[model samples]
Target: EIIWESLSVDVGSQGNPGIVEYKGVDTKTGEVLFEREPIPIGTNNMGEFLAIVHGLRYLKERNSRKPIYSNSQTAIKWVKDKKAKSTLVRNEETALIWKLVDEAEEWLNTHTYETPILKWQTDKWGEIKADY
Candidate 1:
């Protein structure tokens, strides 16, 4: 079965007791497949990265590859180009974020035999499921 997915982030303001949450939903079915909590206090680039990670976490058990979408072009590009880079490299500043990215990439690699991880950009307006 073909699945369309979209990613979004909810970032809280300073001292607002607000939480940073990210979500991924199956657009056609209006089903949310994944979410994240305890994220940083902004719509960080790294937050998008985590959204991609959690979005694809379930794909490892699926028999067929599925297509997921994201507003972050970086995540998609990294998957296509750096299938070999170990995100475990020694950059302490970004080390934690890269670790999560590495795990996501590793999970994606298993399905590469089927579809090589397809990524689409969701529409900026009109009838977007993630908007809901």
Candidate 2:
């Protein structure tokens, strides 16, 4: 499951930009696998795309198909329908975000092995922050 950093981000500016990880246990022997790290992205949206890109790359490489889950509507909509308009805070930075995402979508369509099924978690986005 992909858990988007939302209230946690707003509560405190104490988190990495891109954090990707996984955790699971072996049903038979109780073995476990866990990996977590924050990767640097060109931008926040770029980070978001990188997360998905990284996940897809890994899954495809392993020839594994799993139902990906995310608690972020923004990410969900962006993945499903690139043209879907979002209500995210807008400005010069976010405007660039939209453009970046559009291109990213094109890239995903042209370049990718497996696009996993994506589902949204339905959590409401936060209010405008101090920067806005």
Check candidate 1 and list the clashing pairs. Answer: none
Per-residue lDDT for 23-62 in model 1, tens only?
6666567676666655433334445555655555555445
Candidate topping TM-score: 1
Which stretch of 10 consecutive residues in model 2 shows the poorest summed lDDT? 5-14
Which consecutive 10 residues in model 1 have the weakest lDDT in total? 9-18
lDDT for residue 26 in candidate 2, whole number 0-100: 23
How does each model score on TM-score?
Answer: 0.55, 0.42
The alpha-carbon deviation from the true structure for residue 44 of candidate 1, after best TM-score superposition, in angstroms, is 2.4
Give the clash count for model 2: 0
The per-prediction tally of clashing pairs is 0, 0
Q: Tens digits of per-residue lDDT for model 2 on 1-132?
A: 343321111111123322223222222232332222432222444444434444455456666655443334565566656443444455564565455556667756776554454444335533312111
The reply for model 2, stretches above 4 Å from the true place, is 1-46, 82-103, 112-115, 120-132
Tell me the lDDT of model 1 at 40.
Answer: 34
